[model samples]
Target: MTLAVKVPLKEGEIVRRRLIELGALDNTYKIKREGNFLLIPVKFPVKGFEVVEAELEQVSRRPNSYREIVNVPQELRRFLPTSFDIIGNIAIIEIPEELKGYAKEIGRAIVEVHKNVKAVYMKGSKIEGEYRTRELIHIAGENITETIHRENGIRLKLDVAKVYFSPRLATERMRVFKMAQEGEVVFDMFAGVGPFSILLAKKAELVFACDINPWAIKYLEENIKLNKVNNVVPILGDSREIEVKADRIIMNLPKYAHEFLEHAISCINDGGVIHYYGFGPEGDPYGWHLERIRELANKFGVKVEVLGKRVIRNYAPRQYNIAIDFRVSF
Candidate 1:
């Protein structure tokens, strides 16, 4: 509705005079020139004036001439409050407007714009038929268009999200999967689309994937068939309620994973492993959290060894995404 521009110009300059003739005045606006820079303020609460056309001309300071041109769309110009030059393909607008209402629409539009920029695919029922038109990576090596490839195998394809790649999830899963061995019984608590469980099923003899999200469970069921894996048992319930005993377990529900560590340990056999995920600060006394597992394992007369601990990413200011890998032995 209003715009404040700082152009490189001087008082009585030809450009300044032309800008005034273009509807920049005092009662409705204010203009001041300061040594090659013209500061202008435009009126707001404007009505009947729709921005049908606009452009950004790149003027060289040394030569004082327009060096480049940029065309701004009419629909998009309505959203711009100030003039700006284009750098690459992005149209950067300087505006102070509440954009929360258009967040979802903006997110979708961004997905559509960069959908084909990268080629990666998710190869499971985790991405159902309905999600085809949405943002996803394209798959290779196997025919994934009509059939789903949900088996214990290496994922050659990249993982792309609605706007970016699922790098955090992929990294966590890869670390645990690397530690898996044959004939091991593994449990994936909070197995969101079966990424960890299905991928581990390629090496582990048995996998019990559990999640409370119905849609996730539904995709888990489809993933079992798509991967052509028969060793995996998809459980559509909370991980705390599952009764299966596993030699290794993965708890990936970041924020509250510590709350379920006791329940997770209860289902792990002696000399087992627990790849735990949580949210906390780096080196800010992980003992307090790990001690809970130590105390719980003490009830079963098992020795707990924390093999590794790390801050995987920044979850918030002064807080980080943490991971603790350990083994329980009798």
Candidate 2:
């Protein structure tokens, strides 16, 4: 039997407060309601209140994680990921093969906890094609794909299906912005909707935002208007086709950065910096990129001074996305 202070129904609140003030209230158990009387649980018997023996229920704690609320088979519970990406009120989950059938259940739990999330989508296919877009399969909530993603004090508007943008790269972009020198002319080789170009425009005298995709340029132009930054010049067509020079060049397309490295080197000014991004194996990632830099430096007959290098994040199981910032000195 638990110790409780029995009081009249009308006097329950006052007696409960008195018991609390006297350090006689036990928080571990729930108060019992016995028709006309309320039996409030207490730490010990109090002299002023009616102390008696009574039964009380233990408090049931609520769960904080989505996994706890998610209704997955007990055997397959280990397959669920602990985390996912939320971009502009939309939850994008990378479902494992085993849990693909239970996407709807998982999405429901996600929305229940994260009330701000309006929709949830599963990455349907590998981010592929010349336009670097994804096949987003909507699992739950509103079926809208277009949303404005805000990052680093800039608003980026794009359709989730038509544009290739990662909310994960926000930190990396801010780091680049901090390293920017004032009034420098910058070139974003593959400026997808001007993530780098528009932000760099604040520091740069002028930024040339170039993309091969028409859809990318269209949004880039709009985002430029949205940000109200007039210094960015959106250019459509290949980076190779345009003959432009820049003090700083961002070679951000890690997959095919090597293909356009030669063209970047040619267009870069003396003592200009090239922020080269690429992917390589775990054991000797930078080795391949270092060798290419040496060969290119010799070909251009320019002394390449390495400023900094770092592994941004893991793109695959063994592969990594890395960046190299080096300045070319003639």
Candidate 3:
């Protein structure tokens, strides 16, 4: 026979913990509710507590719905990804080569596990080309590619197949947004989908945003309007073509930011700040970047003061995404 201890609604969590610590919790029986109180099932009789006899109720035993619903071969179950990324209503997963045969089942499982997901895709190729876009193969759910993603009080409309955008940059973007001042002219050197520029425009006097990708610029223009940002001027060309000097500049193309360092230095006003992102080895992530910045400033005959360095995230086994903030003067 199974037994349960009745506890007040407010003390259910505390009583549950106490029951576990006392080795009185019954794993086979699920906790049931009775009016305003909770019934915690326990093994054997529990001492020093108010108790009552209870009957076992019917409840599903599966704790993970994906593991239960995905009908892959029993031998391949261990290869399924433990987690996936949910961007708006789209679910993105990276299926290993060994499990490619079961991609559709995995995607369907993701949709079942997350009720809000309306589409599912697997990463088909690495992010490449000048546009830095990845190929996505739809596996389940709807076939639509465009979605509205909300981050840090801003709304962005983008097509996952057409542009490059990382939701992981939300915190980093907000950190820079807070440092922006009114009446300052800001420049976004690689403003893909207007993530950084749109938010910075809230506080800055004006923002000159540019991107080389036509698709990115098209969505960026729409996103600027979507966010109702008034101070941003979108340009669909090379950032180097924008000759206007700025009080602050944001260079976010981590893979090629270094190649454009000279152009960034020329466009920044004296005493202005530059937020430069790049990728480097884990052992000395920022050392090479800092040294390069110093060398470039000397080459341009400009003096610079390093403000800070931060590691954004791990990119590979021994590579990291990082940023260096510095103030420059002629």
TM-score of each: 0.55, 0.79, 0.84
Estimate the TM-score for candidate 3.
0.84
- The alpha-carbon deviation from the true structure for residue 90 of candidate 3, after best TM-score superposition, in angstroms, is 1.4
Which stretches in model 2 have alpha-carbon errors above 4 Å?
1-65, 126-134
**Candidates, ranked, lDDT:** 2, 3, 1
Worst 10 residues of 2 by lDDT: 67-76
The per-model lDDT (C-alpha) reads 0.58, 0.85, 0.85
Query: Which residue ranges in model 1 land beyond 4 Å of their true spot?
Result: 1-97, 101-167, 282-285
lDDT of 1 by residue, 1-330 (tens): 235455566434464455556665234334544576665553322232222111223232442211221223442444323332121122222222343233333323322343321222322224466673443223322222222222235322212231122333566677778888889998888876577877888888888888887666666677677667788887877789777798888887777888898887778787689988877655673766776777877876778888898766765357777788899877
Position 274, candidate 1: lDDT = 91
lDDT of 2 at 72: 52
Clashing pairs in 3: none
Give the clashing pairs for model 2.
Answer: none
Candidate 3 steric clashes? 0
Per-residue lDDT tens digits for candidate 2, residues 189-306, read 9999988888899899988999988888888998999999999999989888889999999999999998888988898888589999999888877888989998999998988988
User: Which is better, 2 or 3, measured by TM-score?
Assistant: 3
Top TM-score prediction, candidate number: 3
List residue ranges in candidate 3 displaced over 4 A: 1-3, 6-39, 43-45, 49-54, 58-65, 69-78, 126-134
